[PDB]
Amino acid sequence: LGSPVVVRGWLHKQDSSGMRLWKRRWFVLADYCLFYYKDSREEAVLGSIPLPSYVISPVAPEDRISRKYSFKAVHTRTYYFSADTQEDMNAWVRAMNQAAQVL
């Protein structure tokens, strides 16, 4: 990966299907995209989310997420994310919106 990185670290990503369980992955925001890995070795990339035209917004009322410090990226498909702290949630939403918002 020769891209410059905006931010890295742990987030919980809710699964699409199954029991919709929250998984802890290592996330890298680089080149206007989220890359997720098992861990911080950032060796084998599990998934990719190109962020342009995705709206990242906290705590979707109807979406009834029980877990705290949770936010969502909607493909204006939606992904649900959760940080360990309020500070992290804010840093991530800023970062993702900067990448997403192409005016």
From Swiss-Prot:
Residues 4-101 form the PH domain. It is found in: Cell junction, Adherens junction; Cytoplasm; Cytoplasm, Cytoskeleton, Microtubule organizing center, Centrosome. Required for zonula adherens biogenesis and maintenance. Acts via its interaction with CAMSAP3, which anchors microtubules at their minus-ends to zonula adherens, leading to the recruitment of KIFC3 kinesin to the junctional site. Mediates docking of ADAM10 to zonula adherens through a PDZD11-dependent interaction with the ADAM10-binding protein TSPAN33. Interacts with CAMSAP3 and CTNND1. Interacts (via WW domains) with TSPAN33 (via cytoplasmic domain) and with PDZD11; the interaction with TSPAN33 is dependent on PDZD11 being bound to PLEKHA7 and facilitates the docking of ADAM10 to zonula adherens through interaction of TSPAN33 with ADAM10. This is Pleckstrin homology domain-containing family A member 7. The gene is PLEKHA7.
